[PDB]
Design a protein around this nucleic acid. Structure first.
Ligand code: MG
Ligand code: MG
Ligand code: MG
Ligand code: MG
Ligand code: MG
Ligand code: MG
Ligand code: MG
Ligand code: MG
Ligand code: MG
Ligand code: MG
Ligand code: MG
Ligand code: MG
Ligand code: MG
Ligand code: MG
Ligand code: MG
Ligand code: MG
Ligand code: MG
Ligand code: MG
Ligand code: MG
Ligand code: MG
Ligand code: MG
Ligand code: MG
Ligand code: MG
Ligand code: MG
Ligand code: MG
Ligand code: MG
Ligand code: MG
Ligand code: MG
Ligand code: MG
Ligand code: MG
Ligand code: MG
Ligand code: MG
Ligand code: MG
Ligand code: MG
Ligand code: MG
Ligand code: MG
Ligand code: MG
Ligand code: MG
Ligand code: MG
Ligand code: MG
Ligand code: MG
Ligand code: MG
Ligand code: MG
Ligand code: MG
Ligand code: MG
Ligand code: MG
Ligand code: MG
Ligand code: MG
Lengths: 191, 172, 197, 193, 136
RNA sequence: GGCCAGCAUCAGUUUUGGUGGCAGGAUAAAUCCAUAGGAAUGUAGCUUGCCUCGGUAAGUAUUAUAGCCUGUG
RNA sequence: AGAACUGGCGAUGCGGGAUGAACCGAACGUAGAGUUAAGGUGCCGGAAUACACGCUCAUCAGACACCACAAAAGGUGUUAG
RNA sequence: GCAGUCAAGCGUUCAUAGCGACAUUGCUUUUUGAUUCUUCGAUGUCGGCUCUUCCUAUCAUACCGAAGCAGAAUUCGGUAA
RNA sequence: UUUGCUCCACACAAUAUAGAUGGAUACGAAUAAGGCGUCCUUGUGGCGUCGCUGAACCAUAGCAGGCUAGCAACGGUGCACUUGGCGGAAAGGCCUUGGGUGCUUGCUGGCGAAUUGCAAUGUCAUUUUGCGUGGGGAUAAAUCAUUUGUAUACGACUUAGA
């Protein structure tokens, strides 16, 4: 019905400063920094106090308002990603064939190299994104760990691997082999 | 049906030998000229009493003017309306300045939101919502908050020469 | 009204631009269009890539040569857009479209001249914020236009040498302002400014 | 792509010069005679075109011709042609080109043992040719009247037109073909019993 | 390293916001926003200028940077009292916008002779400026 | 007076403006002024609670250091 | 395919419906000025890219009678009830 | 001829994996009718051969979703000529 | 093949014209944001200011713009020269130096204008071209015929011939 103004609150910590000309957002904190291009949207960001920034929609329709929250959300995980950080954990899952996973490197690169999936003689490679840093977890069996500053990047590099291990031509109920996201959390502990 | 007037119309059954002074009924009618207004009166009367224009007379026809033409009033409005597959009663609220502008936009709404041509609509009640917060529709109550203000983003001036030497600027 | 009119296409809607230009032609006004790669079309990319491929399949069965020609380049798309609005088969038809020129980028002369815009065809002014649109550079290349990279190359280069132009220009008027103020408060100034100048 | 200039060598073989004519014997053979002046003065004229190329140019190609006179042919009239130069950096290319004016380029300097190379050439020519052998169509049956290396049905009643896709008689051969992936089995030398 | 969020700072449709009518009977006339009807319609009143208290479409009117303390839904006379009090007219008067307006209004009302004078003058200014624009 | 025009005053037709005097009506309705009562999208004042020296906020409070609404004249 | 009443086409141009025997409008001596019908006014094309309030975004949107087709049944698309 | 909606049933159990009664809404124009508009001062009358091209309501081949898919094999569906 | 060709200069003659009649007056980017000025820590920075249309800006007085005088300024501008740069996207245009020369309505003078008869586009633009004159500048080829066969129905193609 066109709501004349609804707004949101992006709350800011002690570590970060976040600065927005046109709709180019830059969040910089302890973990480094990241930036996002909200120009596809039409909201109005308004600094109120170093720890608070409202964003708003004037005379907006349902779909528009509905983009308000997700702008807030989007910027909020920019803010978190640069303080706490993101740590997506994953588990190799195989019922006979030991899925063997390694980092390789051709011309800078860094890829995640998956071998022997269901005994496939083929070699799988997922590239490692810029921003994300992969650790092969110690003290955990067949666990892999994608760390880094950006949910979007971590969660995508995560999903790349897990989808490069889709099983074909068998019943995927019985054949549950793969690499799966088993835990999504933060980098800095306690929080 | 145009830009509306509102008419007090008064009619009555034709007087008879043994019933002189028939009863006298009035309707307020929103219509554009008074020629339509009388048509309407008779239209609604025949859907009410045993009369025809043939057997009756208009007694008075009087434009009613808005009591307080530049007072913002909140209107509750009561329509009965015909759709493609049946008929329906409705209640809408309209925040304008006169019953007459209020009925104008109604008729527009019904056209736009419900494809309801003029013929298909009966106005049952147009009434001034006296105390706020008996205002029942959100799209109106939105406009009743204290100290209300708002911007008009992405403003668009209308050029008067095909060509322009600057590049437009929707600031405001 | 003028000898020649140059239009900085960037951000103009294909059909609405077409419509005004067409008329200006027929009314005897020369028009040279620039930067058609940066021309907009309502509706997102895919819709106008569909529409174009829809156009692609129409062709003379017995001889794909002697029937409909499908041009790709933004300019030449914009010309199809435009020609379809001129009785182009008539003598008067060819007459109008002699005056017209459409261009990718901004080449010699016109890059030294000034270009104007058509507010009744500027996308930002017309389209509602919320709706999506297509850029003619992208549409064209995605159907086999060949020169997206080269144009963007030459306009990157152009935009540098004109910034240089602008930089010096804006400076010289800071003087011309500085001049037009040491002669402020003078007797001729007040007289002039009392005549609306 | 558009050609900007073309610096020529100073001295030019009669093998190439002949390519520039249609009646060598009658002619005064004035081809490239004024050009050849341009070198005279110090150098001036050439070194700007050369320079011009360097400043601009996204691609440098080289103008060579054949020594047909070594070939056993009667042909005399040599073949001129542009070969794009794919070593490093424009400048470095035109330097290369200028260095080789009037000078000979080997074949070892282009091809090696077991290289895959493509071959670009005009097919042998057969002249006006029937449909059966030009298109590899079915011979028609023996009994058919008024001819049988034909196509029986040249097309439907509609579109009421013969079509661009149905086979007709006409020129066979003398087509140009770029044929790829032939391997070099031997690169021979001439001075070589 | 403070945070730095741009702004975008719009003129608002708020009770007491003064607009400059552009269409019709009034037009060029100023007026103040009394009550506020909907997203497209406000109630306006411009007594000092002659414009009758009325409902108007916001698209017929252009919002100015000027505003003054006016109670919502205040009648014509109170409008006048608060207007004169706030001295809105002198503010409007003194701004590039309203000045640029008179400037064109004058030019339009010159006389072919006055025009000839404007030229002779523009010659004189040109002589001495181009001269300074050449000495430093 | 042959050919063709321009201007003027008029006549028939018609088109587009400026301006003057009147008649209706709820003898328009409004505005305005007067007056009586009122209420909240509650102005002043007051209380109280946090609070960088008064600013908010949530109570009381119906013209006060803003105003509005309703009828009658 | 066959009846009733009228009005038409046939015998009839003109303006509209792109096109079209029958629809809408209007019925014709030769012309000038005016005003209109039906139907239109982004450009082709004479004529507002006029005003106003809503609705609609379709990876096979939709776009004006006769007319050149779409139905049951579904949708947590969105709008008002 | 081909495709739906409802879901009583079928399917050890379990309406809808795969199917589906009673009803009921449709599409198609390679069936056959119905008709008689066009050709009877003539449009060559069956079938094959040959050759091109188009259609998709896809048999195979590419990539998928589902299963009463353990594997093998199969069935149902999507993008797809 | 009767002194031909080409650039630059002028002369006359034609022949045109999709339509001169003060100026096509150069950032880029964004539009839920920008331009300009200034400051500075040179940044997604501070502060100022503007928009709300080019309704502008520049030019515009003089027999279609005559003949002349002086003054104040050293400014502007036209033209032909010259110095040093820049531009290949279709550059073929732009900027910069230096003397020369004209004009200057920045200001103050002397003279002229009628009879074109009360209006009649009242002729001021720019396309191609032809003929002689004179200043530079330059001195070929293609086709038929013959001929080869990497080509060919005929033409065409491909060779060869002081
Ligand atoms: Mg499967
Ligand atoms: Mg299987
Ligand atoms: Mg009333
Ligand atoms: Mg109902
Ligand atoms: Mg196809
Ligand atoms: Mg591509
Ligand atoms: Mg050259
Ligand atoms: Mg043979
Ligand atoms: Mg064969
Ligand atoms: Mg063979
Ligand atoms: Mg055959
Ligand atoms: Mg036989
Ligand atoms: Mg006459
Ligand atoms: Mg008269
Ligand atoms: Mg009057
Ligand atoms: Mg107040
Ligand atoms: Mg009839
Ligand atoms: Mg008959
Ligand atoms: Mg008729
Ligand atoms: Mg007609
Ligand atoms: Mg039709
Ligand atoms: Mg057309
Ligand atoms: Mg028109
Ligand atoms: Mg109907
Ligand atoms: Mg439905
Ligand atoms: Mg049942
Ligand atoms: Mg079951
Ligand atoms: Mg059962
Ligand atoms: Mg069949
Ligand atoms: Mg038949
Ligand atoms: Mg027959
Ligand atoms: Mg016949
Ligand atoms: Mg026959
Ligand atoms: Mg036949
Ligand atoms: Mg037979
Ligand atoms: Mg399909
Ligand atoms: Mg699928
Ligand atoms: Mg089961
Ligand atoms: Mg196929
Ligand atoms: Mg198809
Ligand atoms: Mg012409
Ligand atoms: Mg600013
Ligand atoms: Mg600046
Ligand atoms: Mg700043
Ligand atoms: Mg300007
Ligand atoms: Mg002069
Ligand atoms: Mg050009
Ligand atoms: Mg004088």
């Amino acid at each position: 019905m066109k709501y004349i103004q609804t707004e949101q609150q992006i709350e800011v910590p002690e570590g970060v400063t976040v600065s927005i000309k046109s709709r180019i957002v830059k969040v910089v904190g302890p973990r480094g920094t990241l930036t996002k291009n909200l120009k596809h949207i039409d909201v109005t960001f308004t600094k109120v106090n170093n720890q608070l920034i409202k964003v708003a929609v004037h005379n907006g329709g349902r779909k528009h308002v509905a983009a308000l929250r997700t702008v807030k959300s989007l910027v909020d995980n920019m803010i978190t990603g640069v303080t706490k950080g993101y740590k997506y954990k994953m588990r190799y899952v195989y019922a006979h064939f030991p899925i063997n996973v390694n980092i390789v490197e051709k011309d800078g690169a860094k890829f995640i190299e998956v071998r022997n999936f269901l005994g496939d003689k083929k070699i799988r490679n997922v590239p490692v994104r810029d921003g994300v840093t992969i650790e092969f977890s110690t003290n955990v069996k067949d666990e892999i760990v994608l760390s880094g500053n950006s949910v979007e990047d971590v969660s995508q590099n995560a999903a790349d691997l897990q989808q490069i291990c889709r099983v074909r031509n068998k019943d995927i109920r019985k054949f549950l082999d793969g690499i799966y996201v088993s835990h999504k959390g933060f980098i800095t502990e306690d929080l | 049906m145009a830009h509306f007037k509102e008419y007090q119309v008064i009619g009555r059954r034709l007087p008879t030998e043994s019933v002189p002074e028939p009863k006298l009924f009035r309707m307020r009618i929103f219509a554009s000229n008074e020629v339509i207004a009388k048509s309407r009166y008779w239209y609604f009367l025949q859907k009410l009493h045993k009369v025809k224009k043939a057997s009756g007379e208009i007694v008075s026809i009087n434009q009613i003017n808005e009591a307080h033409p530049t007072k913002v009033k909140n209107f509750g409005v009561w329509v009965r309306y015909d759709s493609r597959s049946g008929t329906h009663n409705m209640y809408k609220e309209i925040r304008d300045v006169s019953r007459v502008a209020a009925v104008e936009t109604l008729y527009q709404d019904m056209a736009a939101r419900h494809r309801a041509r003029f013929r298909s609509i009966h106005i049952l009640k147009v009434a001034e919502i006296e105390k706020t917060a008996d205002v029942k529709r959100q799209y109106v109550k939105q406009f009743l908050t204290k100290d209300l203000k708002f911007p008009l983003p992405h403003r668009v001036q209308k050029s008067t020469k095909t060509f322009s030497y600057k590049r437009p600027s929707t600031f405001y | 009204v003028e000898p020649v009119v140059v239009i900085d296409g960037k951000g103009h809607l294909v059909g609405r631009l077409a419509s005004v230009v067409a008329k200006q032609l027929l009314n005897g006004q020369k028009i040279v269009v620039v930067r058609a790669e940066e021309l907009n079309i309502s509706g997102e990319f895919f819709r106008n890539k569909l529409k174009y491929h829809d156009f692609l399949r129409k062709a003379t069965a017995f001889n794909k040569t002697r029937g409909p020609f499908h041009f790709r380049a933004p300019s030449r798309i914009f010309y199809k857009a435009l020609r379809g609005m001129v009785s182009h088969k008539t003598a008067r038809g060819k007459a109008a479209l002699e005056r017209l020129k459409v261009f990718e980028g901004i080449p010699p002369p016109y890059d030294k001249k000034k270009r104007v815009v058509v507010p009744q065809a500027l996308r930002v002014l017309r389209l509602k914020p919320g709706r999506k649109y297509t850029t003619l550079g992208k549409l064209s290349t995605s159907v086999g236009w060949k020169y997206e990279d080269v144009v963007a190359k030459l306009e990157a280069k152009r935009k540098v040498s004109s910034a240089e132009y602008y930089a010096k220009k804006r400076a010289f008027t800071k003087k011309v302002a500085s001049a037009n103020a040491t002669a402020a408060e003078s007797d001729v100034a007040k007289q002039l400014a009392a005549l609306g100048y | 792509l558009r050609s900007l200039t073309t610096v020529w060598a100073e001295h030019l073989s009669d093998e190439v010069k002949r390519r520039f004519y249609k009646n060598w014997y009658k002619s005064k053979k004035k081809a490239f005679t004024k050009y050849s002046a341009k070198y005279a003065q110090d150098g001036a004229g050439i070194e700007r075109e050369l320079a011009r190329i360097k400043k601009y140019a996204s691609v440098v190609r080289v103008l060579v011709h054949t020594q047909i006179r070594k070939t056993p042919l009667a042909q005399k009239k040599a073949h001129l042609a542009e070969i794009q130069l794919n070593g490093g950096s424009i400048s470095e290319k035109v330097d290369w080109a200028r260095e080789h004016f009037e000078k000979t380029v080997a074949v070892d300097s282009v091809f090696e043992q077991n290289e895959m190379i493509d071959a670009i050439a005009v097919t042998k020519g057969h002249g006006f040719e029937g449909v059966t052998h030009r298109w590899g169509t079915k011979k028609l049956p023996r009994k058919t009247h008024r001819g049988l290396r034909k196509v029986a049905c040249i097309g439907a009643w509609h579109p009421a037109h013969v079509m661009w896709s149905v086979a007709r008689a006409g020129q066979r051969g003398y087509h140009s073909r770029t044929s790829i992936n032939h391997k070099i089995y031997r690169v021979g030398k001439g001075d070589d019993e | 390293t403070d945070s730095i969020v741009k702004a975008s700072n719009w003129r608002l449709v708020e009770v007491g916001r003064v607009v400059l009518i552009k269409k019709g009977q009034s037009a060029g006339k100023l007026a103040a926003i009394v009550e506020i009807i909907d997203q497209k319609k406000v109630l306006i009143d411009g007594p000092k200028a002659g414009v009758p208290r009325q409902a108007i479409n916001l698209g017929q009117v252009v919002l100015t940077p000027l505003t003054f303390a006016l109670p919502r839904g205040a009648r014509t006379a109170t409008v006048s009292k608060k207007w004169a009090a706030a001295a809105v007219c002198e503010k409007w008067a003194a701004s590039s916008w309203a000045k640029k307006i008179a400037q064109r209004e004058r030019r339009a009302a010159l006389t072919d002779f006055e025009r000839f004078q404007v030229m002779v003058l523009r010659k004189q200014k040109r002589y001495t400026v181009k001269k300074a624009l050449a000495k430093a």
